[PDB]
Amino acid sequence: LDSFEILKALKSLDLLKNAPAWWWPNALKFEALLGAVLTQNTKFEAVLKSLENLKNAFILENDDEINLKKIAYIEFSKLAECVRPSGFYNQKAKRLIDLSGNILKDFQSFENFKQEVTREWLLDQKGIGKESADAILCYACAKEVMVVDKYSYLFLKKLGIEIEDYDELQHFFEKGVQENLNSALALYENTISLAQLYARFHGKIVEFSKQKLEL
Ligand SMILES: c1cn2cnc3[nH]cnc3c2n1
């Protein structure tokens, strides 16, 4: 049992029929990074509300470079109010503002950030965990990184393989793909990237998990 076998089996379930191409809505945009941070320790449904708040308040509009600067310079207590629904809202506002200000400071623009960010840089941002860091890397920056989480741990454990450590679990999941790269890609069309494959693969596990299915 490896992650390629799991991908094929999950894929044949058609779990993403209703999803966008990268699973995460508004993938590859600033909003994906905001979601990746806001989703920590909460339900994604709640994250969607925070983003709705941000949009309804015209804090987030159509230009991501403007959006980045808006979040970096927004009054703490206003942002904190906005992201109430996803909980831990004072911590997350501070986290987002510091992150956004540090992106500007180190990378000048969100565009350049998407190109130059590393996991270690993200991990040096106070409050950003591996999962969030990785979700930013994959779902906001199109990097070849597969997010893992509690879902993936529990999903694998049920299939008979237990990997508690975040990095080893992720390596287990990435390596089965890497090892069968051409055959994994061939499941699609040779249309999509490996980053998108990971984006979708993690999506499948999440969806599989919410739907309460058996492999
Ligand atoms: C449905 C779509 N989703 C996108 N991104 C997420 N991050 C965590 N859960 C989700 C999710 N559920």
Side-chain angles (χ1 to χ4, degrees), residues 87-104:
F88 315 100
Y89 55 89
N90 292 287
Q91 291 171 89
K92 286 174 184 176
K94 171 72 140 106
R95 198 171 302 162
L96 282 178
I97 294 168
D98 283 357
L99 166 58
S100 298
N102 287 346
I103 290 170
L104 292 168

Side-chain angles (χ1 to χ4, degrees), residues 18-28 30-37:
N18 294 304
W22 285 67
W23 178 66
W24 206 295
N26 287 127
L28 311 174
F30 185 57
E31 181 184 316
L33 172 161
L34 304 170
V37 183

Side-chain angles (χ1 to χ4, degrees), residues 1 152-157 159-162 208 213-214:
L1 174 80
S152 308
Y153 172 70
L154 298 180
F155 172 81
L156 229 209
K157 180 214 217 163
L159 297 184
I161 293 174
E162 152 155 23
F208 176 94
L213 304 158
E214 315 272 353

Side-chain angles (χ1 to χ4, degrees), residues 28 30-42 44-48 50-69 71-74 76-104 106-149 151-157 159-203:
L28 311 174
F30 185 57
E31 181 184 316
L33 172 161
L34 304 170
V37 183
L38 288 174
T39 197
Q40 200 183 273
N41 290 311
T42 196
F44 197 63
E45 302 65 26
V47 172
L48 280 178
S50 296
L51 295 171
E52 220 206 332
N53 285 351
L54 289 169
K55 291 170 207 195
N56 294 161
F58 312 108
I59 293 167
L60 247 32
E61 286 179 292
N62 298 302
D63 184 318
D64 277 356
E65 298 303 347
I66 288 174
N67 288 170
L68 177 55
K69 287 185 185 158
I71 299 298
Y73 290 94
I74 190 158
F76 170 79
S77 73
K78 173 148 162 193
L79 178 58
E81 240 1 92
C82 301
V83 302
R84 230 170 238 277
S86 38
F88 315 100
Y89 55 89
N90 292 287
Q91 291 171 89
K92 286 174 184 176
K94 171 72 140 106
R95 198 171 302 162
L96 282 178
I97 294 168
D98 283 357
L99 166 58
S100 298
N102 287 346
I103 290 170
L104 292 168
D106 287 359
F107 308 110
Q108 298 72 58
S109 76
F110 177 67
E111 183 167 355
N112 184 53
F113 164 87
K114 290 206 252 166
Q115 186 180 278
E116 288 314 317
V117 68
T118 57
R119 193 204 215 197
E120 301 70 20
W121 191 91
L122 285 166
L123 286 179
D124 281 334
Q125 308 305 307
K126 187 126 183 183
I128 291 165
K130 288 172 157 162
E131 183 178 338
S132 285
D134 292 347
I136 288 165
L137 288 174
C138 175
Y139 290 104
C141 306
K143 307 287 172 156
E144 283 164 3
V145 168
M146 193 170 157
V147 176
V148 291
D149 48 5
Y151 283 135
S152 308
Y153 172 70
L154 298 180
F155 172 81
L156 229 209
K157 180 214 217 163
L159 297 184
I161 293 174
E162 152 155 23
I163 311 162
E164 274 234 295
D165 172 84
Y166 181 109
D167 292 334
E168 307 176 2
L169 210 220
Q170 167 174 75
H171 196 225
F172 165 89
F173 265 108
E174 288 180 359
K175 65 187 288 96
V177 181
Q178 288 166 162
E179 278 151 18
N180 293 281
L181 184 56
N182 280 324
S183 313
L185 295 195
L187 308 173
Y188 292 87
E189 335 261 288
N190 302 354
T191 27
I192 73 150
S193 60
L194 176 57
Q196 188 177 352
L197 188 156
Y198 287 149
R200 292 184 66 96
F201 192 171
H202 165 69

